[PDB]
Design a protein around this ligand. Structure first.
Ligand SMILES: C=C(C)CCOP(=O)(O)OP(=O)(O)O
Ligand SMILES: CC(C)=CCSP(=O)(O)OP(=O)(O)O
Ligand SMILES: [Mg+2]
Ligand SMILES: [Mg+2]
Ligand SMILES: [Mg+2]
Ligand SMILES: [Mg+2]
Lengths: 295, 259, 259, 279
């Protein structure tokens, strides 16, 4: 019988403990203080868990996936640090503390964000043990594609550049969410699946599954942005309200939005049938959590 | 610059244009394309191809790495000239031109760096044996040179340079960080991809370190001229020494870069 | 435990008093003797004798190093407390009293540091063949820990701390440099002088590094309270974990200050 | 010898090169910047030369003695940085440039000075090649002894403590000079001689040569100030001060009678330069 609250609590402790060891204070002190301030402040660690669970699922173990797990969380973090900046969404609260730029200045926030980005590649590349070199290289390429101009960054740029778009087609709103949010989650599930020794078909099935929960994650993000408070979320909530932004709660309203998340979850879990139900329990659990989290 | 260097530089430019083709979403790839070429050219990049050739290999073996070096640098240049609302970065006289707004520059910077690793992970040829161990090693040099203890420490400490009240020693250190390490990385990566032995890699590395440092001082001379040729002779000397041991049709070109 | 650590501070003290005889010119040795002993003792020295015995050596084999660590520590203590003209170093609220003028305290610290190295070189027993290498190594260890990279760095960054406005990450870092480096040094030297293998030395060095950071972090709690206990345990955890492989009383008595 | 100046100049050069390589700018930057500010400010590099010359004198090579040469210049330099301090001589200038604490603050001047002192031991200990461990430890022993409470620092305390009782006799003035100047030259020549593998007898003669030229320098220096408080002229007059200088010089040179004439030449040439400086 699957105790999800228990599984996540320990996975996150384990992920938090490795994030703290991988990014230590060292000269130049402010850059490093700024990296740790946002990285270890306190996210849910969905991506690093997804990575670890996909690796364990296809036969590998946490230790081989941990550096990539940390890497996806490094890149996730810097992407929020850069998203919060005044030239971007200009927020004052993230993970329950003042945003990084407000505590270190805009200069350091940009630089430390860049530092985390580069170091995620250094760390996965240099610290992964238990994987042939061609396998690491391959994972670095997957990571690169999922966070760049055909992934995270592309989603984010069409996002700020489509904030006046009032004639927002769903095909356009899906381009954004798939890229700015689903792309990074897919990469997280893929790095794990490949590092655990998974066969191409299992990788392909988990990529599909990941695209599902990846979209589900953004729909859910948009619904909390609208039904929860800033204290609750830990970040500034309600700006997506005002702006001409393309959230789902826009084009279909919170209700037709919830039903949609419901279909997505199911659809994702349907991809998990490829695997033995006992082994898929963690990813099934991470999926409902993505759907049912309060923050 | 010299014919040889400008020709190497042009191949990197060609390789970059053939690699970044404007397509939809143009709102994404136009800025990506423009900003790549709007960054100044960097010798840490041509040095990667050159170092390669000198030890053995063929320049094509190091192209992907050379492109990645340019891109990591391009991303850093874009971010260091970013319009910052809060006056966090000592409003630098630079005032360079900006085709796009701050948000798109910030983000494009963020998309350019991963592109560098992409070309690297995807330059892996089935017909190359030691391909993955060297690519991997090169990714590590690149992400370190562009990371918090490399080029980033250089950009950070550079904000503390107060025009004509900051010493030559400090300025040389910022150039060491900001340009030296990337150059050292470029010559080493080239050396690696070429196939040299540890002893040569370090020699070329040390050469890149000194040359990039000297180059940064040159671009800093146009700023505050306190730069004696004492500082330049120093670095030039340090550079050529590391090159002792390489003779031939390029090992005099590699020397020309500093001479 | 309780009386073991005391007999230790006392042996180190009787060796110092026997080594620093007030004599002519008293103008020189009066201050030298006074300041050595007016300096709060440091666990870094205690830790050195304990690690030497822990690995099997005789307490005397480490006495010179242990006294050198106190002397290096005493000099830094005298120097970090110098009344200064310019407002360089923030004013210590808990101000020490001075029986001698600034000039004499400054010069004396300059004479105390080399006296420790003198004691070490002078402790080589010509009838003991392993003596030179272990002592050589120890001098390298202490000169590095009290140098620009170790203790000096913590002393220097310490001045950037604003009492109610400085993160715990910054502070733990200043403690790892100001106290941790030296404690790590003390345990490592104690193990070296004791005959231990590389494996035991590193483990012991690691423990000291965590112990000093931890102990210095308490010296600080007095001052700025943001004194989380989440860092206290994160460190002793990492500390007490380095002992793993080592078990017993001392192999778990070291786990007596981490209380 | 021929071209003594060219010889001191080749030495200052290879030493400056080695100093630059030994102490690079690095974090924390103000500490390291302050260390190089004073260490690399150019000077005659006499101490390093003594170390190197002594090593070569007994068969050693410049290479083995270089870390030790850099070390004594390191010590020399921080003794000057500390001495310029407001609580010491309070100097705002030295050789036409702002003094170290005026450029970086008293705190960094103090700390950087301390860093040069322990780094001297470290560099000697860790960079010396071509010497057996016991030799290197002995040599670290002689450095400590030459700059501590029975060497440089003693000479520096007793002097700051005698800037008050203007009744200093010949014996007291010599104490200060021998400790404030000769001790560290003695240290330079002894490290070189030992690292070079010279006999105990050889080391002793070199120790004597240094004590003679150390004092020779302060005496000569007092003579020049006059023919341009306690000084050799206020104590024994210029005539006798000069007789003394010549005796010091002659004694120094006597120490070198038994080494190869050609290796001894730079040392003999340095003693005469010290004795006949016009300035
Ligand atoms: C909706 C997106 C793309 C990012 C914010 O994600 P998270 O909800 O994962 O926030 P954290 O837990 O990391 O703080
Ligand atoms: C998807 C990326 C890279 C960043 C955040 S998207 P967002 O600004 O819509 O949401 P939040 O800032 O998390 O509130
Ligand atoms: Mg946003
Ligand atoms: Mg936002
Ligand atoms: Mg004086
Ligand atoms: Mg003076």
């Amino acid at each position: 019988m699957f105790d999800f609250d228990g599984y996540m609590l320990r996975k996150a402790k384990s992920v938090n403990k490795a994030l703290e060891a991988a990014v230590q204070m060292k000269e130049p002190l402010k850059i490093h203080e700024s990296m740790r301030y946002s990285l270890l402040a306190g996210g849910k660690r969905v991506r690093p868990m997804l990575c670890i669970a996909a690796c364990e699922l296809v036969g590998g173990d946490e230790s081989t996936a941990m550096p990539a797990a940390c890497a996806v969380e490094m890149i996730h973090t810097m992407s929020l640090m850069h998203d919060d900046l005044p030239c971007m969404d200009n927020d004052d609260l993230r993970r329950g503390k003042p945003t990084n730029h407000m505590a270190f200045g805009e200069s350091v926030a940009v630089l430390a964000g860049d530092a985390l980005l580069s170091f995620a590649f250094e760390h996965v590349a240099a610290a992964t043990k238990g994987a042939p070199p061609e396998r690491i290289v391959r994972v670095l390429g997957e990571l690169a594609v999922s966070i760049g101009s055909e992934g995270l960054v592309a989603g984010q740029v069409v996002d700020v550049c489509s904030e006046g778009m009032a004639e927002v087609g769903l095909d356009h709103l899906e381009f954004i969410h798939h890229h700015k949010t689903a792309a990074l989650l897919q990469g997280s599930v893929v790095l794990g699946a490949i590092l655990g020794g998974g066969k191409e078909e299992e990788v392909a099935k988990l990529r599909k599954f990941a695209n599902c929960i990846g979209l589900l994650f953004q729909v859910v993000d948009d619904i909390l942005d609208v039904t929860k408070s800033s204290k609750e979320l830990g970040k500034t909530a309600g700006k997506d309200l005002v702006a001409d932004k393309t959230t789902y709660p826009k084009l279909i309203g919170v209700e037709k939005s919830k039903e949609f998340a419901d279909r997505l979850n199911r659809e994702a879990q349907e991809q998990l049938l490829h695997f033995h139900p006992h082994r898929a329990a963690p990813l099934i659990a991470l999926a409902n959590y993505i759907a049912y989290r309060d923050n | 610059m010299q014919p040889y260097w400008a020709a190497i530089e042009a191949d990197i430019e060609r390789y970059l244009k053939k690699s970044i083709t404007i397509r939809p979403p143009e709102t994404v790839f136009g800025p990506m394309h423009h900003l790549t070429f709007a960054a100044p050219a960097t010798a840490a990049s041509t040095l990667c191809l050159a170092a390669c050739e000198l030890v053995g290999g063929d320049r094509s073996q190091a192209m992907a790495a050379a492109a990645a070096i340019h891109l990591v640098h391009a991303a850093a240049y874009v971010h260091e000239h970013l319009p910052l609302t809060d006056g966090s970065r000592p409003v630098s006289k630079p005032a360079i031109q900006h085709k796009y707004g701050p948000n798109v520059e910030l983000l494009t910077g963020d998309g350019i760096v991963p592109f560098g690793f992409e070309l690297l992970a995807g330059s892996v040829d089935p017909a190359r044996t030691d391909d993955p161990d060297r690519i991997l090693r090169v990714i590590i040099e690149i992400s370190r040179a562009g990371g918090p203890e490399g080029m980033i420490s250089g950009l950070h400490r550079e904000e503390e340079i107060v025009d004509g009240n900051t010493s030559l020693d400090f300025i040389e250190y910022v150039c060491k960080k900001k340009y030296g390490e990337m150059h050292a990385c470029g010559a080493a990566c080239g050396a690696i991809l070429g196939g040299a032995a540890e002893e040569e890699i370090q020699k070329l590395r040390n050469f890149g370190l000194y040359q990039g440092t000297l180059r940064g001082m040159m671009e800093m001379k146009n700023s505050h001229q306190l730069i004696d040729e004492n500082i330049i002779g120093k670095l030039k000397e340090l550079a050529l020494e590391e090159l002792g041991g390489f003779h031939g049709k390029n090992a005099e070109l590699m020397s020309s870069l500093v001479a």
